[PDB]
Design a protein around this ligand. Structure first.
Ligand code: 9CK
Ligand code: NA
Ligand code: NA
Ligand code: NA
Length: 164
């Protein structure tokens, strides 16, 4: 059915724990598959070793730029960018997993995990899953953020993959 994937996250080389995510392949199969394959690394690239580069408390934690590590890059398993699949799922609260973008039809690999309800993003960012377990780990990441988005420690996805 829907993939179950994980991210193992550290701060300055010290493990924070594991975030487990359900990917809603039943609703957004192309977007879920991109994220799933970027977690396993099976296309030869993906999230392992990349950072949460923008973390804003009471908003979201953003990651996935594994090419430039600064929020300007990333790429999908299909190419540089792929279309917005649909906007069926909404930003209903903390734990929502959604695609970052540079406007319409610019999904690549960057994504974010919400720490509040961000419904003002509905219809603009493609939601494709949610946190199953590890929201406390997401809160630890959040604690190293700032209003500017700059982190006070280097937040790295040390490992990632698929559980089922
Ligand atoms: N393929 C690709 C994808 C993205 C980018 C860089 N674009 C970017 O970060 N846009 C901002 C964004 O997506 N987001 C999601 C949550 C944080 N955020 C936000 C949204 C509304 C208002 C304030 C903020 Br902050 C380059 C290449
Ligand atoms: Na369910
Ligand atoms: Na905000
Ligand atoms: Na269009």
């Amino acid at each position: 059915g829907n993939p179950l994937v994980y991210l193992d996250v550290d701060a300055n080389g010290k493990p924070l724990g594991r975030v487990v995510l359900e990917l809603k392949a039943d609703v957004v199969p192309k977007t879920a598959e991109n994220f799933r394959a970027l977690c396993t690394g099976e296309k030869g690239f993906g999230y392992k070793g990349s950072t949460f580069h923008r973390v804003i408390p009471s908003f979201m934690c953003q990651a996935g730029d594994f090419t430039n590590h600064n929020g300007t890059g990333g790429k999908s398993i299909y190419g540089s960018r792929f279309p917005d699949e649909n906007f069926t799922l909404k930003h209903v609260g903390p734990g929502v997993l959604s695609m970052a973008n540079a406007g319409p039809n610019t999904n690549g690999s960057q994504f974010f995990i919400c720490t509040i309800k961000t419904d003002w993003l509905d219809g603009k960012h493609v939601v494709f899953g949610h946190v199953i377990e590890g929201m406390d780990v997401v809160k630890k990441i959040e604690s190293f953020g700032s209003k500017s988005g700059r982190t006070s420690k280097k937040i790295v996805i040390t490992d990632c993959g698929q559980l089922s």
